[PDB]
Design an enzyme around this catalytic site. Structure first.
Site, mmCIF file in Angstrom:
data_model
loop_
_atom_site.group_PDB
_atom_site.id
_atom_site.type_symbol
_atom_site.label_atom_id
_atom_site.label_comp_id
_atom_site.label_asym_id
_atom_site.label_seq_id
_atom_site.Cartn_x
_atom_site.Cartn_y
_atom_site.Cartn_z
ATOM 1 N N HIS A 1 -5.905 -4.369 -8.679
ATOM 2 C CA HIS A 1 -5.503 -3.532 -9.805
ATOM 3 C C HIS A 1 -5.731 -4.185 -11.167
ATOM 4 O O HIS A 1 -5.558 -3.515 -12.187
ATOM 5 C CB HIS A 1 -4.022 -3.154 -9.689
ATOM 6 C CG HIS A 1 -3.712 -2.255 -8.538
ATOM 7 N ND1 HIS A 1 -4.229 -0.981 -8.429
ATOM 8 C CD2 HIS A 1 -2.913 -2.431 -7.457
ATOM 9 C CE1 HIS A 1 -3.781 -0.421 -7.320
ATOM 10 N NE2 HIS A 1 -2.986 -1.281 -6.709
ATOM 11 N N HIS B 1 -4.244 1.857 -1.830
ATOM 12 C CA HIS B 1 -4.312 2.308 -3.207
ATOM 13 C C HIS B 1 -5.717 2.108 -3.759
ATOM 14 O O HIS B 1 -6.462 1.223 -3.326
ATOM 15 C CB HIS B 1 -3.312 1.563 -4.090
ATOM 16 C CG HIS B 1 -1.918 1.553 -3.551
ATOM 17 N ND1 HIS B 1 -1.440 0.546 -2.740
ATOM 18 C CD2 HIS B 1 -0.895 2.425 -3.705
ATOM 19 C CE1 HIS B 1 -0.188 0.800 -2.410
ATOM 20 N NE2 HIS B 1 0.168 1.937 -2.984
ATOM 21 N N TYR C 1 2.551 -4.681 3.315
ATOM 22 C CA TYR C 1 3.938 -5.050 3.049
ATOM 23 C C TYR C 1 4.892 -4.905 4.232
ATOM 24 O O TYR C 1 6.107 -5.115 4.059
ATOM 25 C CB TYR C 1 4.434 -4.255 1.849
ATOM 26 C CG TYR C 1 3.540 -4.466 0.637
ATOM 27 C CD1 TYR C 1 3.598 -5.659 -0.083
ATOM 28 C CD2 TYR C 1 2.606 -3.506 0.244
ATOM 29 C CE1 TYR C 1 2.799 -5.869 -1.160
ATOM 30 C CE2 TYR C 1 1.796 -3.716 -0.835
ATOM 31 C CZ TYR C 1 1.896 -4.906 -1.534
ATOM 32 O OH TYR C 1 1.099 -5.164 -2.624
#
Ligand SMILES: CN(C)Cc1ccc(S(=O)(=O)n2ccc(/C=C/C(=O)NO)c2)cc1
Ligand SMILES: [K+]
Ligand SMILES: [K+]
Ligand SMILES: [Zn+2]
Length: 358
Positions: free
Chosen positions: A134, A174, A305
């Site tokens: 990101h 993502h 995660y």
């Protein structure tokens, strides 16, 4: 006789959240993955590649000097300043060791790419944190400080030739906004992302992540976004996406090096992704990419995660790089209807640019 590299360093565990010890981007994400490699005795089958810090010169390959200077100053900030500086970004916590750990994960990958491109190893896996995809040129985002996989592609270009063709496959759940942006005008680096989208509602909440963003300038065609909408996606959806889009485009690109932004938050059991890709699934995806670029593959940990899920999943990926047979994959049920609509949408956006799509 082909060697598989593996880089891991305990010091990357020192980056941490001092106000919420339970924040999901946990120091023991890398120690759990590594420990799982000992249990399956894959560790002794790999060559150990050492980690190092990236230079600030190397960081300037993709990041502004202003952004380097602010993160760097945080190594000596008081807690109240660490918190205020962290809140100036979208989803970032910072401790005094954060800077060094972001230097360590990029430098681990430069060394891994160097071992590949000198022929010292055939392929490699990089167990690193904090993640990178990101991070923008000018700013931090979403647990990421420096764009490790983008920096790795430019470093690779810097030790070969500038136009070395690098494919980046990003299977984190993502969208990698920072990576797309860094190479959007670039025809030398092919960015292919799979990601949950939901018409712009899933993180990172931008319509940059839709299938119609195909690149700018001489880079028109070299940005491929495959977004999912409205379905709990799994092994069928990702096998069909590789089969129709990723592998045809990538064979036609003919890369000289393959980087995987390998986040495992699309794995069954993650508390953020809502998807159900299996460790078997991730292994098959690894096995397919192994057919490109004469096998020069580097696996970079990004998100992911659920501690058990990311350990099993990356370990399967290392088992493919070492040459073991792909595991029994269950049944490719028909795709969720919306996943078909998605794939067709990408075929129509990219068939004008790739002669192997229709
Ligand atoms: C819904 N509106 C309020 C926007 C929004 C804000 C914050 C969060 S968040 O805090 O839950 N968050 C941050 C980063 C990641 C994933 C990182 C990763 O794995 N990349 O691979 C998850 C979610 C949504
Ligand atoms: K992705
Ligand atoms: K590109
Ligand atoms: Zn993610």
């Amino acid at each position: 006789s082909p060697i598989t590299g593996l880089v891991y360093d305990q010091r990357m565990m020192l980056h941490h959240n001092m106000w919420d010890s339970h924040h999901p981007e946990l120091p023991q994400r890398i120690s759990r993955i590594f420990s799982r490699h000992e249990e399956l005795r894959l560790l002794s089958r790999c060559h150990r590649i050492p980690a190092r810090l990236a230079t600030e010169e190397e960081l300037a390959l993709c990041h502004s000097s202003k952004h380097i200077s602010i993160i760097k100053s945080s190594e000596h900030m008081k807690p109240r300043d660490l918190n205020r500086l962290g809140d100036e970004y979208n989803s970032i916590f910072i401790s005094n060791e954060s800077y060094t750990c972001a230097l360590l994960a990029a430098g681990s990958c430069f060394n891994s790419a160097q071992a590949i491109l000198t022929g010292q190893v055939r392929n490699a896996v990089a167990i690193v944190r904090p993640p990178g995809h990101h991070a923008e040129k000018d700013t931090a985002c979403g647990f990421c400080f420096f764009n490790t996989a983008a920096l790795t592609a430019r470093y690779a270009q810097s030790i070969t030739r500038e136009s070395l063709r690098v494919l980046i496959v990003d299977w984190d759940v993502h969208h990698g906004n920072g990576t797309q942006h860094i190479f959007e005008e670039d025809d030398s680096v092919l960015y292919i992302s799979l990601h949950r989208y939901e018409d712009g509602a899933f993180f990172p909440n931008s319509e940059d992540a839709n299938y119609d963003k195909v690149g700018l300038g001489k880079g028109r065609g070299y940005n491929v976004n495959i977004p999912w909408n409205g379905g709990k996606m799994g092994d069928p959806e990702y096998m069909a996406a590789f089969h129709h889009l990723v592998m045809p485009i990538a064979r036609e690109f003919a890369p000289e090096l393959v980087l995987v932004s390998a986040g495992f938050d699309a794995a069954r059991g993650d508390p953020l992704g809502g998807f159900q890709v299996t460790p078997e699934g991730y292994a098959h995806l690894t096995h397919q990419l192994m057919s490109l670029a004469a096998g020069r593959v580097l696996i970079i940990l990004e998100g992911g995660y659920n501690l058990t899920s990311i350990s099993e999943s990356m370990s399967m990926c290392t088992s493919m790089l070492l040459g073991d047979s792909p595991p029994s994959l269950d049944h490719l049920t028909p795709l969720k209807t919306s996943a078909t609509v998605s794939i067709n949408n990408v075929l129509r956006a990219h068939a004008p640019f790739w002669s192997s799509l229709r």
